[PDB]
Amino acid sequence: SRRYDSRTTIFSPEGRLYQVEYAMEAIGHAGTCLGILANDGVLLAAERRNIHKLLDEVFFSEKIYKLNEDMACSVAGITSDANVLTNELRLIAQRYLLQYQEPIPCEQLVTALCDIKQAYTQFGGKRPFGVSLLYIGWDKHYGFQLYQSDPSGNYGGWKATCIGNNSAAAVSMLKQDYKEGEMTLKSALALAIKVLNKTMDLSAEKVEIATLTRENGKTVIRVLKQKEVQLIKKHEEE
Amino acid sequence: RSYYS
Amino acid sequence: DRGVNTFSPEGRLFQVEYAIEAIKLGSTAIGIQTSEGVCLAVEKRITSPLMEPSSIEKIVEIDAHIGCAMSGLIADAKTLIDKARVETQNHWFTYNETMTVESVTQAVSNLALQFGEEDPGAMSRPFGVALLFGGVDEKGPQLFHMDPSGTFVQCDARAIGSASEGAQSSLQEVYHKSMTLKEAIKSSLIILKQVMEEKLNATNIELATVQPGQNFHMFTKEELEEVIKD
Amino acid sequence: SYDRAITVFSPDGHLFQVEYAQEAVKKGSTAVGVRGRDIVVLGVEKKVAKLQDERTVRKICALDDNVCMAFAGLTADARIVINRARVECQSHRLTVEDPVTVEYITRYIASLKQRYTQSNGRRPFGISALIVGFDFDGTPRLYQTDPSGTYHAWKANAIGRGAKSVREFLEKNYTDEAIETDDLTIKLVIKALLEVVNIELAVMRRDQSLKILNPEEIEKYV
Amino acid sequence: RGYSFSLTTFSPSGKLVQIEYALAAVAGGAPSVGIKAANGVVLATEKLYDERSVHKVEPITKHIGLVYSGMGPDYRVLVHRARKLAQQYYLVYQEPIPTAQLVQRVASVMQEYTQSGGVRPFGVSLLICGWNEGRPYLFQSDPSGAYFAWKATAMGKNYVNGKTFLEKRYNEDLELEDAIHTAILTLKESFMTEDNIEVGICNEAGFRRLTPTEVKDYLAA
Amino acid sequence: GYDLSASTFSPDGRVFQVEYAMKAVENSSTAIGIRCKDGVVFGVEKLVLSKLYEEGSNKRLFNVDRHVGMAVAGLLADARSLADIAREEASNFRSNFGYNIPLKHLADRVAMYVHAYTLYSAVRPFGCSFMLGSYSVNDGAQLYMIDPSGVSYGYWGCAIGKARQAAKTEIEKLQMKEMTCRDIVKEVAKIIYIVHDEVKDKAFELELSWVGELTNGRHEIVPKDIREEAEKYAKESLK
Amino acid sequence: SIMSYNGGAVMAMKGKNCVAIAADRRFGIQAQMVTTDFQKIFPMGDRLYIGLAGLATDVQTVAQRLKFRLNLYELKEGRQIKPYTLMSMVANLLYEKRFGPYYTEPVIAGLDPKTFKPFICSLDLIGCPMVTDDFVVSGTCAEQMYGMCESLWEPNMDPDHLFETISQAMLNAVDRDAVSGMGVIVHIIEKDKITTRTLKARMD
Amino acid sequence: MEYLIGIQGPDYVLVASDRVAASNIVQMKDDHDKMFKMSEKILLLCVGEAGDTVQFAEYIQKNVQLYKMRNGYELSPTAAANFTRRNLADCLRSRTPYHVNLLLAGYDEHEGPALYYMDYLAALAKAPFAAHGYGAFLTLSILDRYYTPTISRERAVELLRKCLEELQKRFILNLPTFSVRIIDKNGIHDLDNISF
Amino acid sequence: GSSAGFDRHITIFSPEGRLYQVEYAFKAINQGGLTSVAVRGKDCAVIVTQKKVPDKLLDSSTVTHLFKITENIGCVMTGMTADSRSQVQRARYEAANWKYKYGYEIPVDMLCKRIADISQVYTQNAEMRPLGCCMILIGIDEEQGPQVYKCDPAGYYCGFKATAAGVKQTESTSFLEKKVTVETAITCLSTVLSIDFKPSEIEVGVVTVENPKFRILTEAEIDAHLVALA
Amino acid sequence: TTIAGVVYKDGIVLGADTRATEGMVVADKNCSKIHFISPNIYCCGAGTAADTDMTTQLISSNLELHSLSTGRLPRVVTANRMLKQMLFRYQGYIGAALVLGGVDVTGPHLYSIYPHGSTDKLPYVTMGSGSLAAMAVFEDKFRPDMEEEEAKNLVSEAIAAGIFNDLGSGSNIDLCVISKNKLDFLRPYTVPNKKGTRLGRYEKGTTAVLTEKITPLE
Numbered sequence A: 001s002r003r004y005d006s007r008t009t010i011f012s013p014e015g016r017l018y019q020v021e022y023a024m025e026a027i028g029h030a031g032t033c034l035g036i037l038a039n040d041g042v043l044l045a046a047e048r049r050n051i052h053k054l055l056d057e058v059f060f061s062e063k064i065y066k067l068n069e070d071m072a073c074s075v076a077g078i079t080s081d082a083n084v085l086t087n088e089l090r091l092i093a094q095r096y097l098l099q100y101q102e103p104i105p106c107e108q109l110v111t112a113l114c115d116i117k118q119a120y121t122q123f124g125g126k127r128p129f130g131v132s133l134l135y136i137g138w139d140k141h142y143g144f145q146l147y148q149s150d151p152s153g154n155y156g157g158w159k160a161t162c163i164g165n166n167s168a169a170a171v172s173m174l175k176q177d178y179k180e181g182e183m184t185l186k187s188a189l190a191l192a193i194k195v196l197n198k199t200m201d202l203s204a205e206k207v208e209i210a211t212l213t214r215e216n217g218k219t220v221i222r223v224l225k226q227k228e229v230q231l232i233k234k235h236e237e238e
Numbered sequence B: 001r002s003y004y005s
Numbered sequence C: 001d002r003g004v005n006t007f008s009p010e011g012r013l014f015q016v017e018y019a020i021e022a023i024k025l026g027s028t029a030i031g032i033q034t035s036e037g038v039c040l041a042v043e044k045r046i047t048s049p050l051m052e053p054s055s056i057e058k059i060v061e062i063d064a065h066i067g068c069a070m071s072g073l074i075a076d077a078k079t080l081i082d083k084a085r086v087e088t089q090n091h092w093f094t095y096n097e098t099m100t101v102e103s104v105t106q107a108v109s110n111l112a113l114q115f116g117e118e119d120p121g122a123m124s125r126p127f128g129v130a131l132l133f134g135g136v137d138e139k140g141p142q143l144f145h146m147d148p149s150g151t152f153v154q155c156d157a158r159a160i161g162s163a164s165e166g167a168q169s170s171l172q173e174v175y176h177k178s179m180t181l182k183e184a185i186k187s188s189l190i191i192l193k194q195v196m197e198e199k200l201n202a203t204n205i206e207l208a209t210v211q212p213g214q215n216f217h218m219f220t221k222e223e224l225e226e227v228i229k230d
Numbered sequence D: 001s002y003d004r005a006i007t008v009f010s011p012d013g014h015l016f017q018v019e020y021a022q023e024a025v026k027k028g029s030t031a032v033g034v035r036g037r038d039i040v041v042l043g044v045e046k047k048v049a050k051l052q053d054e055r056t057v058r059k060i061c062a063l064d065d066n067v068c069m070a071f072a073g074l075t076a077d078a079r080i081v082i083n084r085a086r087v088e089c090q091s092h093r094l095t096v097e098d099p100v101t102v103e104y105i106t107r108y109i110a111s112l113k114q115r116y117t118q119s120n121g122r123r124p125f126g127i128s129a130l131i132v133g134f135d136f137d138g139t140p141r142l143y144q145t146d147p148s149g150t151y152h153a154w155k156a157n158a159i160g161r162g163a164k165s166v167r168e169f170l171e172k173n174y175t176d177e178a179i180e181t182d183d184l185t186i187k188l189v190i191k192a193l194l195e196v197v198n199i200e201l202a203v204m205r206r207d208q209s210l211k212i213l214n215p216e217e218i219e220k221y222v
Numbered sequence E: 001r002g003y004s005f006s007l008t009t010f011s012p013s014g015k016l017v018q019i020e021y022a023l024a025a026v027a028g029g030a031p032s033v034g035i036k037a038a039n040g041v042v043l044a045t046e047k048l049y050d051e052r053s054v055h056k057v058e059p060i061t062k063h064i065g066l067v068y069s070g071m072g073p074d075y076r077v078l079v080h081r082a083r084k085l086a087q088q089y090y091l092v093y094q095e096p097i098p099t100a101q102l103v104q105r106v107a108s109v110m111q112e113y114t115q116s117g118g119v120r121p122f123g124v125s126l127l128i129c130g131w132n133e134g135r136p137y138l139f140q141s142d143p144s145g146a147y148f149a150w151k152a153t154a155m156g157k158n159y160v161n162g163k164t165f166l167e168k169r170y171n172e173d174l175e176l177e178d179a180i181h182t183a184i185l186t187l188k189e190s191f192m193t194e195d196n197i198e199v200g201i202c203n204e205a206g207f208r209r210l211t212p213t214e215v216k217d218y219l220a221a
Numbered sequence F: 001g002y003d004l005s006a007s008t009f010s011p012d013g014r015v016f017q018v019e020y021a022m023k024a025v026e027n028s029s030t031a032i033g034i035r036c037k038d039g040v041v042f043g044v045e046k047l048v049l050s051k052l053y054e055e056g057s058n059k060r061l062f063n064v065d066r067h068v069g070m071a072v073a074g075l076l077a078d079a080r081s082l083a084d085i086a087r088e089e090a091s092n093f094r095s096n097f098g099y100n101i102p103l104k105h106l107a108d109r110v111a112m113y114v115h116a117y118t119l120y121s122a123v124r125p126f127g128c129s130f131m132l133g134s135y136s137v138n139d140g141a142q143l144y145m146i147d148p149s150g151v152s153y154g155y156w157g158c159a160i161g162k163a164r165q166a167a168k169t170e171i172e173k174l175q176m177k178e179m180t181c182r183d184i185v186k187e188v189a190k191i192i193y194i195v196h197d198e199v200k201d202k203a204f205e206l207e208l209s210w211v212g213e214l215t216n217g218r219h220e221i222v223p224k225d226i227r228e229e230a231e232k233y234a235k236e237s238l239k
Numbered sequence G: 001s002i003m004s005y006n007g008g009a010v011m012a013m014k015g016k017n018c019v020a021i022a023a024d025r026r027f028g029i030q031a032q033m034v035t036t037d038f039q040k041i042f043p044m045g046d047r048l049y050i051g052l053a054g055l056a057t058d059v060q061t062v063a064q065r066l067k068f069r070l071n072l073y074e075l076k077e078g079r080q081i082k083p084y085t086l087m088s089m090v091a092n093l094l095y096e097k098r099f100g101p102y103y104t105e106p107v108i109a110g111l112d113p114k115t116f117k118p119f120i121c122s123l124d125l126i127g128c129p130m131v132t133d134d135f136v137v138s139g140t141c142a143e144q145m146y147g148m149c150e151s152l153w154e155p156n157m158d159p160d161h162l163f164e165t166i167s168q169a170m171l172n173a174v175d176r177d178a179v180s181g182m183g184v185i186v187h188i189i190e191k192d193k194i195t196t197r198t199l200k201a202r203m204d
Numbered sequence H: 001m002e003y004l005i006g007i008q009g010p011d012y013v014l015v016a017s018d019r020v021a022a023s024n025i026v027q028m029k030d031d032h033d034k035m036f037k038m039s040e041k042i043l044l045l046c047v048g049e050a051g052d053t054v055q056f057a058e059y060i061q062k063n064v065q066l067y068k069m070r071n072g073y074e075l076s077p078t079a080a081a082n083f084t085r086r087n088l089a090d091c092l093r094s095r096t097p098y099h100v101n102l103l104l105a106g107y108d109e110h111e112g113p114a115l116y117y118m119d120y121l122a123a124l125a126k127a128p129f130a131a132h133g134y135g136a137f138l139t140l141s142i143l144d145r146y147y148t149p150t151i152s153r154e155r156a157v158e159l160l161r162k163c164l165e166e167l168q169k170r171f172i173l174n175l176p177t178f179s180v181r182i183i184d185k186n187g188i189h190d191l192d193n194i195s196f
Numbered sequence I: 001g002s003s004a005g006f007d008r009h010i011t012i013f014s015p016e017g018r019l020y021q022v023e024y025a026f027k028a029i030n031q032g033g034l035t036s037v038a039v040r041g042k043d044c045a046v047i048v049t050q051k052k053v054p055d056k057l058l059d060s061s062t063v064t065h066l067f068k069i070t071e072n073i074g075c076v077m078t079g080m081t082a083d084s085r086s087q088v089q090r091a092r093y094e095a096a097n098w099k100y101k102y103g104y105e106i107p108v109d110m111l112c113k114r115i116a117d118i119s120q121v122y123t124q125n126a127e128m129r130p131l132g133c134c135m136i137l138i139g140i141d142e143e144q145g146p147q148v149y150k151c152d153p154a155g156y157y158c159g160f161k162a163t164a165a166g167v168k169q170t171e172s173t174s175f176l177e178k179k180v181t182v183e184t185a186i187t188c189l190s191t192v193l194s195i196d197f198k199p200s201e202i203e204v205g206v207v208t209v210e211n212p213k214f215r216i217l218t219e220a221e222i223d224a225h226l227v228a229l230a
Numbered sequence J: 001t002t003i004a005g006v007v008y009k010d011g012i013v014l015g016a017d018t019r020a021t022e023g024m025v026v027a028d029k030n031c032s033k034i035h036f037i038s039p040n041i042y043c044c045g046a047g048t049a050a051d052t053d054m055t056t057q058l059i060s061s062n063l064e065l066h067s068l069s070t071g072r073l074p075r076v077v078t079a080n081r082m083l084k085q086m087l088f089r090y091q092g093y094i095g096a097a098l099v100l101g102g103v104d105v106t107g108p109h110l111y112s113i114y115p116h117g118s119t120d121k122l123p124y125v126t127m128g129s130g131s132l133a134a135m136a137v138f139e140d141k142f143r144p145d146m147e148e149e150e151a152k153n154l155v156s157e158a159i160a161a162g163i164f165n166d167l168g169s170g171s172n173i174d175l176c177v178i179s180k181n182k183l184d185f186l187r188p189y190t191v192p193n194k195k196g197t198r199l200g201r202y203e204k205g206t207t208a209v210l211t212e213k214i215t216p217l218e
Ligand SMILES: *[C@@H]1CC(=O)N(CC)C1=O
Pocket: E047, E049, E050, E051, E054, E072, I157, I158, I159
């Protein structure tokens, strides 16, 4: 029925996609999430929106998802939509490995998912996914990498970026502090705490940090324990 | 906007 | 909001009405039918000197014996032109003969009104183009007009596009049954000259003929210059 | 599945969804193309952060060995059109055993765009493209496609934000003297961009494949 | 036939109003309580009627149980799907589905109805309890398809008051016998016989509804 | 604005699209069916809109099986399609079960088809009511009526169209149970002439059919000679 | 015989708190040897392996398609698969092709990733599972392998004794099979380590 | 019958194939080429059923080229070999099986040279040397006899020549000329045809 | 009682999480103007409903709201007549299909659950309306004894000691509550309507433990109850 | 394979051997052929092993769905109908031959189910390659309304007849006793067959090793 159809996949008179823009509004109200590239690894730092005292915490992470052996990601927006998309990312990665018997290069994984998101903006008359994702990974082509995708299916590579709440304020701090080509993981960690310190309105229970490194020709993805997240104490001295 | 160029 | 297959109280399909209006946004095309052949002339309407005039194609060959001038939304016409080309070749394959100008026009007009949201991903709207089909078959030289409604009709002389009303007045004055092809070529160039926005030269118009003698012939730059000199 | 007629005629013979698609193009970064004597040059505006990886966000892309394009508008829509064209270039090599002509692939891209203006359940592509390369006889080519599916060949052209101003500059500047050498051909593109503008530039020479210029080499011209 | 467009879309401020309105149906529902003890989980809910004819506390498998707040008929759909998803898992892996895996699959179904054509979201939130890996689990799944692991929670009418009541009267070391007591007291805050409440427990021996006799005994405390 | 779709209830629990379709029946001229001792008789006030039409044009009486007649009021195109539905249903029944469809079962089946058009925005309700009539030795005489909502009941006597209430008043005066079809055709002719609004609509053809013991359970048009006798009786009764 | 086209042999054997799995290394097409280092045993976890005999194409396909499903399982569930669950996952994969089967009959050998309890099984080509407490064999010399295993196997063998038993069982079995051999690889799975050895073997 | 041979050295792969296209009792072509360039450093050599060979090989070719255009870099030899196998194995039980036997030869910058053998059933094996055709029956033992992993390109060519001479002597079919190519870090190089 | 968008036209949630279209379906039940009562005992279950025959030209034998679903399951329908018949056919289908697949008669609770689950779909999918009717099922269960079940347009269902539907539902519920079987059902309906019935004015259906087969009482059988209650 | 069932006074006794063969070779010495359908219904399987495994698993999970919905204990007739209707659909291509036995609200019931989808309701049945040997015992010794221990003895005798006379049968006897009050899954019930002791006894380094790699874990 033409009466009830909200027409989610049309252009506005200015050549805008309203559903995409309203989806990006949703993301701006989601937990802060940032990623930083260094010379010896990549990291993701996320604000936990959980926060409640009576929560159980059954998983190893809440906002950081492993995608394959060499890749993880984090999300900002509708949680349920993120679950659909991250499942799909795992499927694409496995489909590539089946076919080529090598891991999917990071950009190829991002492009494949963005094609799905783009499709939702052009046909099918459905609402788009209200998710921005940060992807971290290593491949044999470009080494350590960081990507960001948004609801329209646009993506870009970054040395450092932020999505979610107060991301504009975060991107400002990154431009000032990020030493291009001179960042280690230890200094990147420091900068992450420093950025989350300003944008978040800090506790170890309120943040989640994952690092991606190479050890003996093999990728290691680990979520830092509460004790390691010592990093908050190291900043307050500065 | 962020999704043009 | 209304559907694409809605009637007006006057008994007209809105979308078809609006598609006919889009022809008036198109450049002028002229066709004249003589006993010596049919000629087609179209205004190219160059919008910039940086644009290559030869990349503007508003007269196309359908087959050796049939040409086609178009006006309106040119991108819409390409799929109609392909249908005409394929259909003439289908007819040759099956019947080992040339398809008549009328039959080609009929086949193309079958596409029109075949739009609607009932799959999947079929035509959502009518084609916003009018066509002049000019060729030679066993009935002699023939010119047909088809519009977005799918109505087609034989014409002695016809103009389509923005300045067609004025051009049609000029045509009805100058046209006669015993008129030669060389006269018809000159007539349409004189009419195009007066109805065009830009000054008519050898680069901003197209001209083509089909004769009982020879195949569809697109006039070269040098051949256009000869015709203009007068 | 979804069968709503999205692109429809309005009372004056307008296709509003196509016109709105053309507005999306104008929100895009400026892209300039110039066809020289024995060279074709593409140049694009880049708006970019310092923290961004330059390699990932490029508006100049190779379709085949002998064909590349630049775009303005929705970048996601562009990626879809580019990959469709890339598949088609391979299908052509497969069936005809020749590389695509610049005109063939243009015609393909244009008809794809046209289909999305007359198909149920879909909105038009919100990009224009400049397509460059060489034919078999070594003739340089520059074509433009837009959302309606219209295409034309140009000596020089611009698309995206402030395309009208750049076009009027090129009209006054595109002469024999300007395209007499390869250095002056590149210069004319940079001048055209500096009229509305941090710039990315690529050159394609006769049977030599696409070469993207370094930031240090672009800084010399500016 | 069916509508192919979404009935849930983004508003200018980035909200999905249908999901919010679905949560209003949940909050208007009868109160439900879930408490994870050290050695079990307990689910409790408020209810001419034959009270034994329909149940709100429902088994999914031998080790997983469920209760809800919101719209009863929507719940029955998800109960059927959950049971089906649990069997499809068992057929493949020949192992009872982990509670977390069941929740994820059910939440995925709930997500579908926020995006698929011509449908409204479910007007229910779920409390799922389970025992696997010698460990108890309590999850909540909301109309959007978002899920959370809880030590204890409440949903429905007066859930805000119920949650702060639990925050005061719940410790981690508490065992199952005591957890049932405090769950009943939580419902008593916004209310009682063994005919108008339903209680389900989950431990090593699996999931079962407490019998009306068993409930009558706990009310004597 | 609650009256645009059959998939929409009004706040008072009405489906206006069905009611609007029923109005289309109410604007049609009258058809009556009367079940008597040994069969069923149908009559239709068929308005003559033009003298250019042939005598027999726009029939409102149909055979849907050899033993089943159908009388219609409302939008005639919709009625004709329902006649096809009924024919197909009777045909399919014989193929599957190997005997003539009982009238009650045919009524139920067609009614459920009619009903299916009252649920959805995708389709509109039928703008027609119809009567089904049949006779056999085993089942006796049966007369059913179906309306746009898909309701189906059996009747001793029935009327549809604009003068339905006036027709029923006349029908109620008959002890139809005791009368033969021969007597009933005259009464049917009579009642049509009574309810005919001579001032508002001019010119009508009387259309008559029957099924009973006298036709050996076959639905047939009333013979011309008997029809003319009924017309003369109806005319002279009206004074 | 379709199962004898490429030849091959695999067996698994149960010890005290350890398991072993072994395979010949020949890839051949009927009589013709093509390579002498064909992989038939694939890791499915730190302490869990699958060995596949039969049609070489299907050995590779099943290995690759099982890894696909296992990788997805491990990411979703956030844990390593138990050996019995892998057997079920394999059974499911094979039975999907009930009416056009893969020509491979796998053996599974591993320790439970939490209890470190030994597990061995085999499946037929349409995925009928068979769990034993001693040994399982699969390939073109199944009879030769049964004879060696029945004679040599003892319960509660230590890693060193288990190594010798499966080594001698394989070597002496494949030496009576024309289309098996050209080398033997052996994996000993223990709680704390994997030991991989290639044996000195006849190359005829 | 068609003949294929490959010899992997330390930093190169040498490949050769016959140049005959046969039909019944006649040679129809004596300058046939059975090698397909996949990328700058990959060759696919394909023999088997008529139609199937060129259809399959050209399908893989266009897909390997599409990968490069999409990603800006090329498939590694190992990735290309597995891609090829996936496609052939997927079609094995379909309505459209391809009866082809293949060698894939390639050089990777990081992995070095590689040679892959694949039969029509789509079993894939990495080999230091390999051959297809009836000719393989007469030549594989010569390779086994004389091959060492450190063989130079000079010696590889002479060892190839030994195999080809054996075909002239002992093989019942007339195979007079052979295509010869080598792949290394500098790409694919056309060597002289070996002729008799 | 706030509203937004199309929440009164299709089954989407209102701001307070209501489904207006579902609520309107309950109003539709009352458009019939009839009331039905059901009560169960240890020995039997009974359904009583009004039979209004206003016309006289109706064949009153074809005017019924009592339906055999199986030999052992009867039901009474309240609400829109055509909607009712449709739900009866569906119940008959579900019951026959159950027997075929499972080799035993469908339990009353399961049939009611199934019909309710079907109704739920209409409350979630926008393109069709809910049925404006109400179903009450009676039958003997082997283990549980006589059963009375009711489902509604919202997809709710329940077993009852006694229940009612239609215009005087609330008044009937009041009466039945104060009392907690054939005599009870007739008395309840007579009180809330203030009628005092003739045997032709009601319909009665029964299932008993001794006679599980659903039975509709004749006019004489009903009279013997009305005469006894007098 | 030898599988069998009897109806006794108080319920059902199912029996089975434990040999699985691949060709004319013993693959499994301790195969379990009595499959769970529901707490009150079990099923013995002969024929294609994968087919009987998968078929019983499917009906079992469908019956769990069924009983979760009804809240009632499943009926044997339901299992029977579900099995036969599926087997008929596959036209004998699923080679499941089943002895289905259980106790429901209507008492004990025993069915034989063949691959083409025919069923028989009977007081005793046998299936498998050893079925005629087992049936000989039943024909000879079966009486109606047997005590529990009598029925157990009769079934174990029937299986044993199969074990000793059929090359396709061997190893152990398994029993399953189903009544209203209990379920006794006896595995094994009897072990008539045992491997003889070894008369001859069979060092580190006996096997020559070419290459070795040790990978430490955790
Ligand atoms: C159905 C009928 C009943 O009593 N319940 C519990 C309140 C239902 O949900």
